[PDB]
């Protein structure tokens, strides 16, 4: 028989407390729910009694109660809630405000019914994402956080421990499917992605649980799992994990909470588990007022008799139902008891604010508010209550507020599963999540820095700052690191930047400033001998000219050409000087100038030879000197003009195992020297041809023999060295060494030939 | 505020906008003659026929229960509680609800009825919100929603090849939701919108004039898609009258075929396409409706009020202000018209009757005169199973064409049939004429269009480019494409930039048409090199004559060696042939260099004056050097020049690209060395021959030196091509041969 708890008052508040259990199909309303129906109903009754008496909240207006039952059903809840609007559509009593159905389906149906009829609803216990949608339920409010705030808490706690690679376990139906999507979407911003988004059905086999545990075990680098399951589903999952000897840092939703029955029978495989539970505190006044009730005291509650008959096995015919003390009996307060009184006080505050803002003349309820409207109340007063929670502890601070979506503030208490030194296994509180995350890291022994914490990142990156090549789509959570090639540089963290193949990047991997080279690497092989020979050649010229000066005042020297001897001596000194200074730092006008002078010096020797054999072959002397001087000047002018026009100096090997060459402007001198070499070769060839037909008359102490020897020696040396110069041109180091030797060799041959006349002069 | 009620086994609910929406103290005032009263009798007429006919529910009598809504959300919502109060004036259970003419009214009723498992079918609600079955589990319509109107016009643009269009809308559910549907359909069919905008309810001409002006700045779109109600439709036409232009209007059910839209502005609305719901008139209903009088129609309480308002007369308690109604007064066709949605109301009534008959037949096998256990009704079984799957012909069909079949889709929406109305001038008088239909595929009659096929407006963006001469680039919008010209010597690109084939390729109309079409040393020798060749041929003839006389004389070998070099140089010009070859080019370069070397070295013996063996040995050394190049990998097959920068259609290769580069340098060095030695030797010698011979020998040396020196800048600046390369080589070799022969043959001829 349907019954209603009714109280007479100016303003009446509805009720849909599920006192009766749903039961089986045969019994629509069988067993009486005491923890969730009777306790919360008595909490509402106590809140109404307290608000009635207190002269500070709606001081004059008295509040009534119209409490019904839902029987944990939706159609029955709708049928009972139809009585709420049976008087407000236009003895039945007008009902304003209801306190929800204490479920998801019941609250959804009640809100859908009351949205059209303009009746506000404040559900004391309802956590669903559908009710947060204002398009379908714009008149629904709740004092409990929705199911996506615990997702925020779990994502934040995962971020705090630097865990980014996680595996999610879902559940069939509501609270197991919606939570996964919200958690994933929220973890997208926090750079956290799923690994195995496995789901568990309602009737899911034990061997199937073992297979699912093996599926979780398939990923090796996944030591953390987030659980969205109901209590018994979590119990069976932990049992399967214990049977398969699988251990993870379990992270769980409100389903696990701090219930001992969930972990009971599976101890050992749940150590280090992290769980979050809704924050609540016991109320001493309600506990004293509930234990101050026996069946013969209260009449207002029609279901109190059924609760008494259910709780104690006595009977109201004649039995222990009158000797049962009920005092000092094992009793526990339901977690969601303070929410009921908070909702009642929020409704009382909204009504008081409405009365104050609409009836400011007298404390009595004015008649101007007779057409009660839920729209104005919900928009102005219900959604703008900011008051301290009644019966709150003095040390703590609690404020009841509603958001723009009608949901209450979120506060979750994080729990950890320990190993007591002397006690048994039990839970504890290590932190809370009201507005900002906070935990005591040192409190947890398992999740401590010293007891082998598990990052479970799966993408560990121990690579150096200059050895990162993380170029792979993979997953946005993390990526693998590879050292860059030595030829490249790590200028950019994402991709190695191969700014230059030659130079090796520095430690910072950003100094793409090239790699130089030196041409001053003196050694025993290429510097000890080559430098001495060039210096000796210049010194030998000084010794040679000394004999000539002493022999200048001699009849023998008069016959020989004084100008030719001086020109030959100057050319030998000039070529030797260029070779001696060739070992120097190149610049714009150092290396280029030195090589240009060497070509002129070599041509001077060829010109001196030409003017020394024409006279012998013929047999005006000034004509030969002028012609030779013009040829030397013409060759120098042609070379000098080419320097400005077609003598660009640049060269460096970068790709194949090499750095920038040690050169400034004498890099392309091979092309420039081709013209000078061709002129020198032609002059040498012409001199040799003339010398072949010369030396007919052996005059001047057989000086023609010396001239012929030079032609047969200088041409042979130049011809032999020609393939060497072309071959050595490939490598700069080889070319420099060969060039110095060739210049010194040419000067030595000329100096050696002139040694014989010096010996005759001395002797 | 009353209620039609008739006892029966089953009863159907009713909600009609009998009274128009009012203001002030009165919730609703004047009665609605067309929307409310006319549709009221249509359901009553339909329900009466069901009882009379024995082919549909023979033993089951269908009741009636109609409650006024006054076109108000709050009033209609509170009037639906009667249909659910009896499911827990004696309350009686309601089998179903047939009512709701306004989208807002139906939304409120659907929300309440879906919770109590009561199927409801609406006869005019075309809102797209009701199509969301998640929010409204139990709702069905006999009319198509606003989605299909956008779909119908989406196919119209595709049929007429219209892509660049302008869309307008109006504030409210109709304009906002309708315009959104068109965008979704246009995206799949590739239609892009232009200057899309919406108008408000301010009813100010300044805002409307601004909207019209906003169309002027975009002349590429001369077709406008309309999603606005009939209330402001006349205002836009009036606004468009000022500063008139040319536009084509593609309107929706708001405009329709109503003549009140156009009033003195029939010039800007010319050639407008409008969509109107298909609704055949009901012949039977006209006879039934005209036979209603207040004397016997006691069931309808609103009939008396309608009679007073329509005729402006009072029947009871008549005052002096209103005349008493005359006797023998009946409604006639002179001032009576059929409502556009009468057939939809009749179909809605038949939907439950067929559904109830099917459920009665199955759940009560072999039963009649009421049913068994059809006391409580299950919404899920009746609606989701025995109501959505229905296929019966429309009752009272004037033609029985069977095209009109009453059925519900997956979402419960009725079949969507529309009529395409075209606005045209006939006989100087503007009129509306249907020119097609839209059941599921758009069907149009081209011949039905009058005085509008002369222009056939297109309004197309980004007329397609020709990839042959210009390429395509991505503009700001993907739908439109711009023409970009690329360089002509690269092959066609389908959508991207024209990729370059390279050098020497001439693309054609084909996409990959570009291919190697190299020229073979383009024949400019006939114009350029023929002259030097003919001169060389004349020199060869002179050389042959010189050889002939020398051969005849027997000591009257040095001359033969010199003559051989001249003859070899003669064929050097003919050696260069248009046909490419990797061996002829190398041989020609070697032969030309060898011929110059032996000829130059011939005078060396004369200056020095056993000698024959030395000359032969020296000549062999020059030949060995020439063939030394061919020994290495210097020689290679000829290849086209990489003249990418030059815009040359064809590439001509004749020098093999490795011969002229190396042979010219080698030949110049060899020629310079011998020339310098000969010049020096000539001066040194004190004329060891005849006076004429000494002068001729000396003069010859200068001629070769001058020619070689003059030709040296030519080699550097030759710029080897089909003409200059051949002409320069032929000219240079001709001078050398003539100089040698000139200084040798002349002394012999004189002596
Ligand atoms: N709001 C609760 C939360 C509930 C729940 C709680 C914990 C674990 C599983 C679980 O299943 C779902 C699924 C969807 C939505 C809510 C829940 C309810 O039962 O609906 C709970 C206040 C109600 C009461 O305890 O009276
Ligand atoms: N079904 C209609 C369609 C109506 C409508 C029709 C054409 C142009 C604008 C327009 O405004 C909207 C806006 C949203 C939804 C429906 C409409 C209704 O009013 O609900 C129409 C049968 C009702 C009647 O008046 O007879
Ligand atoms: C997480 O990483 C941060 C790096 O910014 C570090 O400071 C913090 O100590 C880490 N937390 C751990 C290892 O628990
Ligand atoms: C539209 O274009 C198609 C080709 O895509 C053509 O076949 C058809 O005739 C056109 N319709 C017109 C121009 O009305």
Residue numbers in the entry:
A (entry chain 2): 22 to 111, 132 to 660, 675 to 818
B (entry chain 3): 30 to 117, 137 to 604, 613 to 665, 684 to 825
Task: Please share text taken word for word from the publication where this structure appeared.
In addition to homodimers, these class C G protein-coupled receptors (GPCRs) were shown to form heterodimers as well. Here we report twelve cryo-electron microscopy (cryo-EM) structures of the mGlu2–mGlu3 and mGlu2–mGlu4 heterodimers in different conformational states, including inactive, intermediate inactive, intermediate active and fully active conformations. The Venus flytrap domains undergo a sequential conformational change, while the transmembrane domains exhibit a substantial rearrangement from an inactive, symmetric dimer with diverse dimerization patterns to an active, asymmetric dimer in a conserved dimerization mode.
Each of the three cryo-EM datasets of mGlu2–mGlu3 in the presence of the antagonist LY341495 yielded two inactive structures with distinct TMD dimerization patterns. When bound to the antagonist only or the antagonist together with the mGlu2 NAM, the TMD association of the heterodimer is also mediated by helix V of the subunits (termed as dimerization mode II). Extra rounds of cryo-EM data processing excluded the existence of mode II in the heterodimers bound to the antagonist and both NAMs, as well as mode III in the heterodimer in complex with the antagonist only or the antagonist together with the mGlu2 NAM. In a bioluminescence resonance energy transfer (BRET) assay that measures glutamate-induced Gi activation, the crosslinked mutants displayed a notably reduced maximal response (Emax) compared to that of the wild-type heterodimer, indicating that locking the dimer interface in the inactive states impairs receptor activation.
